[PDB]
Coordinates of C-alpha atoms and ligand atoms in Angstrom, one line a residue:
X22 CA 0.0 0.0 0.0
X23 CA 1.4 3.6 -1.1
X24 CA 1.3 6.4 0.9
X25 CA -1.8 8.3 -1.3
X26 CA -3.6 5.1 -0.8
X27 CA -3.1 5.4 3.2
X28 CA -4.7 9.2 2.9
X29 CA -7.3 7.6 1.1
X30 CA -8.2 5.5 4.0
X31 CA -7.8 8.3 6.5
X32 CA -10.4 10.0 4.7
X33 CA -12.5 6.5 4.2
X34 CA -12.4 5.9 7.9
X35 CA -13.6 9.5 8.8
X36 CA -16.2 9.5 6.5
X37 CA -17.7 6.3 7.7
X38 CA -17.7 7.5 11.6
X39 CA -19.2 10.8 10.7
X40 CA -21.6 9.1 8.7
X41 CA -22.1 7.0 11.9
X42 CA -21.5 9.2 14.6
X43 CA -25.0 9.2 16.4
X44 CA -24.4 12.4 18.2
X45 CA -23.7 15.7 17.0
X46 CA -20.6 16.9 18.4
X47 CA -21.9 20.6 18.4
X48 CA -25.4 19.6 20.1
X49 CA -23.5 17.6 23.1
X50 CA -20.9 21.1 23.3
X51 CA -24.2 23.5 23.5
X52 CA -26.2 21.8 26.1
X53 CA -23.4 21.7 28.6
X54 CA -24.4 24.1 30.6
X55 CA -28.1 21.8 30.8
X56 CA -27.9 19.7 33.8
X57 CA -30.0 17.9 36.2
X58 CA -31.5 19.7 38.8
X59 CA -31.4 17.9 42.1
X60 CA -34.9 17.1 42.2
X61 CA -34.6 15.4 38.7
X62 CA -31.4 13.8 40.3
X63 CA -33.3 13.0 43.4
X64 CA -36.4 11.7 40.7
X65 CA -33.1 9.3 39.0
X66 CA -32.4 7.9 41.9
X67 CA -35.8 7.3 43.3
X68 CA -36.8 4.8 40.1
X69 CA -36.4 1.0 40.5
X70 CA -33.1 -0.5 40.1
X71 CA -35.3 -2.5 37.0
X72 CA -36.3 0.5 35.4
X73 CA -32.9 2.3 34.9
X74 CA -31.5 -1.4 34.0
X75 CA -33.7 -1.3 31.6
X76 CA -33.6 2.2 30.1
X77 CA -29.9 2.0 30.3
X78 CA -29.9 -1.2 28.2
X79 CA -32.2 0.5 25.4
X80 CA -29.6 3.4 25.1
X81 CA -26.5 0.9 25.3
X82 CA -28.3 -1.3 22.1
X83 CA -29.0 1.8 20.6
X84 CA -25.6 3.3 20.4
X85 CA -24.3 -0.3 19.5
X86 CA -27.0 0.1 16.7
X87 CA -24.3 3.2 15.4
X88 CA -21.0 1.0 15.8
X89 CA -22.9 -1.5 14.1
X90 CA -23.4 0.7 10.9
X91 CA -19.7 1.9 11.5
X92 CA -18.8 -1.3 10.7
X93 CA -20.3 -2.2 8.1
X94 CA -19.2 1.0 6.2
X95 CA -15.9 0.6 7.2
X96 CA -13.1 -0.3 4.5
X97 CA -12.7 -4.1 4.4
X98 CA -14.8 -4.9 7.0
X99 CA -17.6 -6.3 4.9
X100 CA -15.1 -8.3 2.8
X101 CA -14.0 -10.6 5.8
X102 CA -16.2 -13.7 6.5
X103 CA -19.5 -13.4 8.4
X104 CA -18.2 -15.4 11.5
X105 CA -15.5 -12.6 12.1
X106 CA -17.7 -9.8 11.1
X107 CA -19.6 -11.3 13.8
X108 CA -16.3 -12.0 16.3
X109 CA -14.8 -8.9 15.9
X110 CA -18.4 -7.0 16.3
X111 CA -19.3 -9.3 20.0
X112 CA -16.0 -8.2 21.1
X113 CA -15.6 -5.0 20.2
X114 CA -18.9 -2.7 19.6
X115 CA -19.3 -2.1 23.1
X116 CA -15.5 -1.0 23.4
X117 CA -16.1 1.2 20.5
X118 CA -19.3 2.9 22.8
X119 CA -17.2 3.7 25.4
X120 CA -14.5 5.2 23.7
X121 CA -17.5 7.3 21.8
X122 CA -18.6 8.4 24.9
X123 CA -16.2 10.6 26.0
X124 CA -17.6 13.1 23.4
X125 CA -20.6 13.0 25.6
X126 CA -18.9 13.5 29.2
X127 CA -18.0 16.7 30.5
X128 CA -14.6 16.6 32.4
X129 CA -15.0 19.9 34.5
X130 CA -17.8 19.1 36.4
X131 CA -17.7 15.0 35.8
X132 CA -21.2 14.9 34.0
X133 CA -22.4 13.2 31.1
X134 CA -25.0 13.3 28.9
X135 CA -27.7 11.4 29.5
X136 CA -31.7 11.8 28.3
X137 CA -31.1 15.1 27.4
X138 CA -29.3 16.7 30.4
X139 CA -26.0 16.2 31.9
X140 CA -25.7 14.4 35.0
X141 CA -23.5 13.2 37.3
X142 CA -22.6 9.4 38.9
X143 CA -25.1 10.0 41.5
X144 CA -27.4 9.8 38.8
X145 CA -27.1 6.4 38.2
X146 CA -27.2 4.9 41.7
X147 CA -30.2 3.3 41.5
X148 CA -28.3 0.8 38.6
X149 CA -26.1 -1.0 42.1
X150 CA -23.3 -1.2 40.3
X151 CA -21.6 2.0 41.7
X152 CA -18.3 0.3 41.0
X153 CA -18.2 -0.1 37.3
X154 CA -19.9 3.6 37.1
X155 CA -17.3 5.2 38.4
X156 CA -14.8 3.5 36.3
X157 CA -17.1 4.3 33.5
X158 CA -16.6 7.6 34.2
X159 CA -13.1 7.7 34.8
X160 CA -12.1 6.1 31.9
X161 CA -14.0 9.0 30.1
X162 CA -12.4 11.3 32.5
X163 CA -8.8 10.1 31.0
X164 CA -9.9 9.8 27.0
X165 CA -10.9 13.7 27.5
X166 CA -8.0 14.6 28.4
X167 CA -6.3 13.8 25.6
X168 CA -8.6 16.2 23.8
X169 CA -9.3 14.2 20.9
X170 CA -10.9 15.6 17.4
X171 CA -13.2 13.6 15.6
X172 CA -10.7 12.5 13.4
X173 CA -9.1 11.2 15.8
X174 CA -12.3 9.2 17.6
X175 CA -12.6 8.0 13.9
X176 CA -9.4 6.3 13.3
X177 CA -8.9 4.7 16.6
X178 CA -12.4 3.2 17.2
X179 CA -11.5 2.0 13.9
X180 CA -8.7 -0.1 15.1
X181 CA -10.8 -0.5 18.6
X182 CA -12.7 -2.9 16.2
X183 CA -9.8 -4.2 13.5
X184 CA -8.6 -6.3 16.1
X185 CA -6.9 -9.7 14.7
X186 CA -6.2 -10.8 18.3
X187 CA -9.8 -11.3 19.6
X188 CA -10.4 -15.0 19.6
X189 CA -12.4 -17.2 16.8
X190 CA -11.3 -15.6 13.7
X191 CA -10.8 -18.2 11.2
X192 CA -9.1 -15.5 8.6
X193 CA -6.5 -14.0 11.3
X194 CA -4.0 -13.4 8.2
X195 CA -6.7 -11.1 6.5
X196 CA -7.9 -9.1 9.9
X197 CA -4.0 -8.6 10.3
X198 CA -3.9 -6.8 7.2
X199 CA -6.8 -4.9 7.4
X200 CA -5.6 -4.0 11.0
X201 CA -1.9 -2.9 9.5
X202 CA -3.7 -0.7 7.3
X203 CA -5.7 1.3 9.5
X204 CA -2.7 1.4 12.3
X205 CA -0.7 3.3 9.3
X206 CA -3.7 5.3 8.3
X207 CA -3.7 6.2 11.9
X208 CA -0.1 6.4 12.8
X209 CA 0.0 8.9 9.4
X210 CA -2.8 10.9 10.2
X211 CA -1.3 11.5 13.9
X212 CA 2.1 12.4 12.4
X213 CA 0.7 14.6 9.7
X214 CA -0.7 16.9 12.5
X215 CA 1.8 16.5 14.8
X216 CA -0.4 15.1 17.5
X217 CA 2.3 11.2 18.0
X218 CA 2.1 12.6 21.3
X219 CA -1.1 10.9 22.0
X220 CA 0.0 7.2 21.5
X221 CA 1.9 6.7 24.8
X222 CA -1.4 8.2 27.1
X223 CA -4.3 6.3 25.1
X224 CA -5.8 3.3 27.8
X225 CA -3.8 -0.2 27.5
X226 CA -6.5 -2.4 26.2
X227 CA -6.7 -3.9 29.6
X228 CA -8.9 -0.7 30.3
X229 CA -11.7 -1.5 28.1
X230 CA -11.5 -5.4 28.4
X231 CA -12.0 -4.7 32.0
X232 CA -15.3 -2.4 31.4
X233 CA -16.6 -5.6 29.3
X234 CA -16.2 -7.9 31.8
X235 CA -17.5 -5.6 34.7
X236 CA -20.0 -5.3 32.3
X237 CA -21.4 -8.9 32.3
X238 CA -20.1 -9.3 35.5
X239 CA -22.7 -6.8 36.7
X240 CA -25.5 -8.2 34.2
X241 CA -25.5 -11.5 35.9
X242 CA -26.2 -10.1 39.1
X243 CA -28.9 -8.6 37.7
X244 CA -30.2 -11.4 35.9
X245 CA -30.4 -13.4 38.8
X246 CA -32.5 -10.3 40.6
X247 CA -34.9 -10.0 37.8
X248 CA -34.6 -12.6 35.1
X249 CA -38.2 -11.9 33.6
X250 CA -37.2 -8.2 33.2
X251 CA -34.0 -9.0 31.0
X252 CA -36.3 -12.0 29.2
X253 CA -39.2 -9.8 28.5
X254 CA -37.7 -6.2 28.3
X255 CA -34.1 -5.8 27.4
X256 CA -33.7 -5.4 24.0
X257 CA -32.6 -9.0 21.7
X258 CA -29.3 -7.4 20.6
X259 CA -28.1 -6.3 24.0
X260 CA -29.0 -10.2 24.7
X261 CA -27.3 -11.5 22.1
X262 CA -24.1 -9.3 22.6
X263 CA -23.6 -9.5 27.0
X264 CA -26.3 -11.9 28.6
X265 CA -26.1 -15.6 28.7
X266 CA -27.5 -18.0 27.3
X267 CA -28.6 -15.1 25.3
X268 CA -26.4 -15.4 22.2
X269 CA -29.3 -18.0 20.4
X270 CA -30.8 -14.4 18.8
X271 CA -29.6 -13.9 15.0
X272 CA -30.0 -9.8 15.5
X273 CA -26.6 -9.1 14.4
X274 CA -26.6 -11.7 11.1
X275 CA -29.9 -9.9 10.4
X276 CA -28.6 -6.0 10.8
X277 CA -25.4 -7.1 9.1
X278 CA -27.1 -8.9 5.5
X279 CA -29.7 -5.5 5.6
X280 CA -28.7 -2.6 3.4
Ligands
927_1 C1 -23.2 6.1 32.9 C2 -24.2 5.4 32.2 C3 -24.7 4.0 32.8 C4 -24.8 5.8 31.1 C5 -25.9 5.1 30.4 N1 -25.3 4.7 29.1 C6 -25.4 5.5 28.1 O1 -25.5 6.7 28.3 N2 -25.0 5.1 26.8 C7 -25.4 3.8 26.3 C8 -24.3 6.1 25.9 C9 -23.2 5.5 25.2 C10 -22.4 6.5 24.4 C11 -23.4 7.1 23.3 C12 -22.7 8.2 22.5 C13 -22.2 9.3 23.1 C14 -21.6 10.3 22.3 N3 -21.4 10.1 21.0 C15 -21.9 9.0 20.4 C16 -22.5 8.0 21.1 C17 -24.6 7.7 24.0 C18 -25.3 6.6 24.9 C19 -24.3 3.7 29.2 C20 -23.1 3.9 28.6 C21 -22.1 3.0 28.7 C22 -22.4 1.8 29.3 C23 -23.6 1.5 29.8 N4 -23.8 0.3 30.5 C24 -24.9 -0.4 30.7 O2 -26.0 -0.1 30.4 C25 -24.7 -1.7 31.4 C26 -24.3 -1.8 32.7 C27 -24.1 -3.0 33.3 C28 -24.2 -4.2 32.6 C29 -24.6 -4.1 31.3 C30 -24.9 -2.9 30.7 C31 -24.6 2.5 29.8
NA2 NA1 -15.1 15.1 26.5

């Protein structure tokens, strides 16, 4: 691959996330200054630990519902085999949310954006899982601090997903490729404006497989709490993608042979 062919793919990548991006970045930047009140924080807190599972799972599949469409516009993506499209997708769309979310948290007062106000962690205490919040939070807290442009958000998500290490690919050699590519289209792009600074502070991957596994760590307690809730109102993709033995729905085979 030559070196107008890597630009090409910048621009490719960057085109497919702001294609994709599900948020305005200018409409999360204007309502900063819109935040809870502490009755409506008080009104958060008061709802049933069911009911903000439940909201927060239709907001989660939603936003996976974006990463999804990412994908599938993304360069070479849709030329690997189903099975990894699939592999890659179970392992990484949620760590592509939570690197997208930063662009939705607010680092000088710790708030994000959240049904159309910004709120704090107290917000979501009625969830019981105060632990992985707060590290939900924090790792927001550290990705805005690096101050990233959308550019940026677009490349790296990018190879948050192009990830030839995550287990049960069958064409490794061809995910390895396709993630070489988009490291030098990244690695390019950050040299071209001067911003290689930014390699040595972004999360070790630990960070986010950590999230993941709080994640279903924290499901299963729930489960066990309210099964009929997750059976009868969370949505089939968020089942598929963290619950088990939840993977038996075809949602992402469907949403990946639409278009
Ligand atoms: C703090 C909190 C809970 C917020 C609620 N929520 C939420 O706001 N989401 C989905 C945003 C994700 C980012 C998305 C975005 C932002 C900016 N630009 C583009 C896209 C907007 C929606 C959210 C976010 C990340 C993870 C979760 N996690 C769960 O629901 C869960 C917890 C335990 C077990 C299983 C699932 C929930
Ligand atoms: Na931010």
């Amino acid at each position: 691959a030559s070196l107008t062919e890597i630009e090409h793919l910048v621009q490719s990548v960057c085109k497919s996330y702001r294609e994709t991006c599900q948020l305005r970045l200018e409409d999360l930047l204007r309502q900063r200054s819109n935040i809870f009140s502490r009755e409506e924080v008080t009104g958060y807190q008061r709802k049933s630990m069911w009911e903000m599972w439940e909201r927060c799972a239709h907001h989660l599949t939603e936003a996976i519902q974006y990463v999804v469409e990412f994908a599938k516009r993304l360069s070479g993506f849709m030329e690997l085999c189903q099975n990894d499209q699939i592999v890659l997708l179970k392992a990484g769309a949620m760590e592509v949310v939570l690197v997208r979310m930063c662009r939705a948290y607010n680092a000088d007062n710790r708030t994000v954006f959240f049904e159309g106000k910004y709120g704090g962690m107290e917000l979501f205490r009625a969830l019981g899982c105060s632990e992985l919040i707060s590290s939900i939070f924090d790792f927001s807290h550290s990705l805005s601090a690096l101050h990233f442009s959308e550019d940026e958000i677009a490349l790296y998500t990018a190879l948050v997903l192009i990830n030839a290490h995550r287990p049960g690919l069958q064409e490794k050699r061809k995910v390895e490729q396709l993630q070489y590519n988009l490291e030098l289209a990244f690695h390019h792009h950050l040299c071209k404006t001067h911003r290689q600074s930014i390699l040595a502070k972004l999360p070790p991957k630990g960070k986010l497989r950590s999230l993941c596994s709080q994640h279903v760590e924290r499901l299963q307690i729930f489960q066990h709490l309210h099964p009929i809730v997750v059976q009868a109102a969370f949505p089939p993709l968020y089942k598929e993608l963290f619950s088990g033995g939840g993977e038996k729905h075809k949602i992402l085979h469907r949403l990946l042979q639409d278009s």
